[PDB]
Amino acid sequence: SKPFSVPVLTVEEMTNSRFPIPLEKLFTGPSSAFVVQPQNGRCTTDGVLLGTTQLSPVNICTFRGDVTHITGSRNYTMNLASQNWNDYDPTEEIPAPLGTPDFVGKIQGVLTQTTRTDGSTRGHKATVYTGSADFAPKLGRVQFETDTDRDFEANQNTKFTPVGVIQDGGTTHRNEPQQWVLPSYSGRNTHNVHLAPAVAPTFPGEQLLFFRSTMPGCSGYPNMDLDCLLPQEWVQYFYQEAAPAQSDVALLRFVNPDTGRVLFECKLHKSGYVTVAHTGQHDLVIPPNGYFRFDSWVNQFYTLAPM
Amino acid sequence: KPFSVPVLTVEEMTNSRFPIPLEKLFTGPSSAFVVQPQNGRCTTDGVLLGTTQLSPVNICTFRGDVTHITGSRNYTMNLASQNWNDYDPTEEIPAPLGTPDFVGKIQGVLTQTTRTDGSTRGHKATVYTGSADFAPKLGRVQFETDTDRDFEANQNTKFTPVGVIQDGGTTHRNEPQQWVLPSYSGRNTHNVHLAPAVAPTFPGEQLLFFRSTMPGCSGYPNMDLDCLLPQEWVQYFYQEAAPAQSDVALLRFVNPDTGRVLFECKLHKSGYVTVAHTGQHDLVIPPNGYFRFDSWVNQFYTLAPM
Ligand SMILES: C[C@@H]1O[C@@H](O[C@@H]2[C@@H](O[C@H]3O[C@H](CO)[C@H](O)[C@H](O)[C@H]3O)[C@@H](O)[C@@H](CO)O[C@@H]2O)[C@@H](O)[C@H](O)[C@@H]1O
Ligand SMILES: C[C@@H]1O[C@@H](O[C@@H]2[C@@H](O[C@H]3O[C@H](CO)[C@H](O)[C@H](O)[C@H]3O)[C@@H](O)[C@@H](CO)O[C@@H]2O)[C@@H](O)[C@H](O)[C@@H]1O
């Protein structure tokens, strides 16, 4: 039976699994009042990828395909290809293409394109509104708002590189993005399919432990908070190890290597998320070189020490 | 601890010199120029070299505060560390970790947040790593942007890289130059603490490159980008730190579908790969193919022609 383990990377060394930026901190808070059902950063401890999760940290919230100009506008519809430029299959048993954004918001970035025959290239500021009626990645199409009505060519490889998020400054501050509201992946008036399940702590006194980043903001007053259930490196690690789960819960200790001391302990649930014994919103204060270590598999009644 | 390499496929892995996926394996001669990249540099037993760090998404990013150059749309960034700690120029490295390791014009976006009210802004930005004022080692780099007033002083500012550009009115694909290192402390300075240049030593052997195509944002750039190790291999070795039993690790590239070895190669302890081939060649491989460590070999092992 291959032993289970987690990477020895520090929080700052690891990557958010829901946007291509580093982790900054560990955060716990209550979540009874909203649905925690992210589709990126979803992986079982024995390495089965779930939702829209894929292995590349840099392909998260990227798009590739060809673009068609929406006449009379600076908008373009992208006909999606897969990450390796192969055809996208809309019948695949997934919510949307792997790495598709899993929150409702306005993501700003850059659309780049290369003309195959002469190698000429171009790049333009572009925004994708994932709450848009025309955000339908599951169907293989998404709409980009750009600063040109003529520069992009048809039938040429085009990429969207994400940078950050924006908000309307003339409306309530930090009201968008909404990190826990899933897009409708097939556009307006449709129901999402094949979702990784929503997660919640069940044990008394426990809350989710989030791996938190701050998304860059590009305009207005966005809510830049972004919480993922697992670091991308953990997804990569579990996928590779494929260590069988001996119980439903892996007990982890967060340790200071300088002192050999446990700062706190937590439960890594087999279906791919972490809980801690704490009540309320709290930014964890940790030593920068601290990291997680697998302790042992525990039964369903194990009680965590307060953190 | 036994040595090993990841079982990830080439397409599943990431370029260690720019934050984009690997696309293919490529081999070619390199006797006539210096191959001395500073990112994607790691020994098989887990020692990081050059400007190499672990995060794939921090490669070619910059963070700090910016000062406006009056009479211009250019800004000087006073660099901080990736975690917003003070940058220490006395640290024994060539430059801040993840600094670009080639001379070219990198286009991206400068973003900023105003601490007090959470107001935010983003602007097109280019950094010319061959510029006299490109001095990341001293803690300063210059960005050319599309604004002369929007960025504030003393506020956290980040550069997210997107791609490279070229001047279309000059010879096509003449820039970037992926094998020309910047002068990290600016014009008329000498680099320090570099990861060494690499070359095959065995007769008939060439380097094996892990190749990507950088996005192009304007003109006719040379978008080829070759790294010596995937970023995931760097990550793997750093954590495993498995002792090297010799200077050369024999790898087999195998198809899990049939079990046939397409080819074998040498993973050198100091962190690069060679193969038995003469000439330029894009390798044809199956997407589900991967590398497997078989054994440690001595200095005299002759590779099967590839
Ligand atoms: C909160 C505010 O967000 C950004 O300003 C935007 C405006 O952006 C436009 O004007 C600004 C200068 O005010 C700048 O020139 C930018 O390049 C340009 O696109 C505009 O989108 C309005 C419309 O609602 O919203 C905000 O005022 C940012 O530029 C500011 O620095 C500031 O953070
Ligand atoms: C080869 C060429 O590169 C890019 O064009 C640039 C020019 O970029 C400016 O004009 C173009 C239209 O040609 C476009 O409107 C763009 O938004 C704007 O910045 C310009 O930088 C010149 C200067 O010598 O070089 C190129 O012509 C690209 O936009 C084109 O599609 C094309 O690939």
UniProtKB/TrEMBL annotation, chain B:
Calicivirus coat protein C-terminal domain: residues covered: 81-306
Subcellular location, record wording: Host cytoplasm; Virion
A single Gene Ontology CC term: host cell cytoplasm
Domain of life, source organism: Viruses
Keywords, alphabetical: Host cytoplasm, Virion
Signal peptide (residue range): none
Predominant subcellular localization, coarse grouping: host cell
Protein name per Swiss-Prot or TrEMBL: VP1
Lineage: Viruses, Riboviria, Orthornavirae, Pisuviricota, Pisoniviricetes
